[PDB]
């Protein structure tokens, strides 16, 4: 069904056109807080801001602002936090959000440098003996172990609230092989990565929402959540062919602007959901 629609779009070459229809129909909500002067250095890209209604608020006494959005998919019964790659001055905010929102997993979809450009701060420790302390938000983060695989790496991190000395294990799922240009010929390793995140329990409703990021927190991140939600909808619905990817994406874009940044990414999402549904 969805498969048929896919071929028709490909035959007619109308990916660009469908994607531009999505951009035109997308919600527009205010982002007043994101745009306040005092928040200029908390945004990686001035063109990518959380809506006020869905922005994650930091709890500590201080500016509550982080560039992160809660995406609550009602029907699919899953929530995600989509955020930008942390900046050198917002790594403490980032981990503070993970703590306060009770996330179990963090999903990273870029390498810290790609095509020789910085997309994200080194916001986690690379060596066991060199833990990170975020003095502004009073948190300690330790690498406990890491499982480096061919197409992704999973790290076990210990996050300690230095105020309470409570500790939590955070799973860091780092997809390290998203192509430097365009998207993957095949969705196979992206889909295997998604299933590994699922299998870990990080997406379970007993935890806070998974934190998902890339550089701006809308393109690859949008792909990840879009595919995951569509696959949920396909397995839950009495009629699985009723899942409309374009509608699911528009619904997601009520919570954060600009999810899926290119017609290729849109096409890749279709591919990933189609291939995924089979599995
Ligand atoms: Cl201000
Ligand atoms: Cl939904
Ligand atoms: Cl492997
Ligand atoms: Cl699941
Ligand atoms: Cl990215
Ligand atoms: Cl739908
Ligand atoms: Cl857009």
From Swiss-Prot:
Its EC number is 3.1.3.48. Its main location: endoplasmic reticulum. Changing residue 49 to A/D: No phosphorylation. It catalyses: O-phospho-L-tyrosyl-[protein] + H2O = L-tyrosyl-[protein] + phosphate. The active site is at 214 (phosphocysteine intermediate). There is a cross-link at residues 214-215 (N,N-(cysteine-1,S-diyl)serine (Cys-Ser)). Changing residue 214 to S: Catalytically inactive mutant; abolishes sulfhydration. It is a peripheral membrane protein. GO terms for cellular component: cytoplasm; cytoplasmic side of endoplasmic reticulum membrane; cytosol; early endosome; endoplasmic reticulum; endosome lumen; glutamatergic synapse; mitochondrial crista. Oxidized on Cys-214; the Cys-SOH formed in response to redox signaling reacts with the alpha-amido of the following residue to form a sulfenamide cross-link, triggering a conformational change that inhibits substrate binding and activity. The active site can be restored by reduction. Ser-49 is the major site of phosphorylation as compared to Ser-241 and Ser-242. Activated by phosphorylation at Ser-49. GO terms for biological process: actin cytoskeleton organization; cellular response to angiotensin; cellular response to fibroblast growth factor stimulus; cellular response to hypoxia; cellular response to nerve growth factor stimulus; cellular response to nitric oxide; cellular response to platelet-derived growth factor stimulus; cellular response to unfolded protein. Substrate binds at residues 180, 214-220, 261. GO terms for molecular function: cadherin binding; enzyme binding; ephrin receptor binding; insulin receptor binding; non-membrane spanning protein tyrosine phosphatase activity; protein kinase binding; protein phosphatase 2A binding; protein tyrosine phosphatase activity. It is an enzyme of class 3 (hydrolase). The modification Cysteine sulfinic acid (-SO2H) is found at residue 214. Residues 2-276 form the Tyrosine-protein phosphatase domain. The modification Phosphotyrosine is found at residues 19, 65. This is Tyrosine-protein phosphatase non-receptor type 1. It comes from Homo sapiens. The gene is PTPN1. The chain holds residues 2 to 280 of 435 of the full protein.
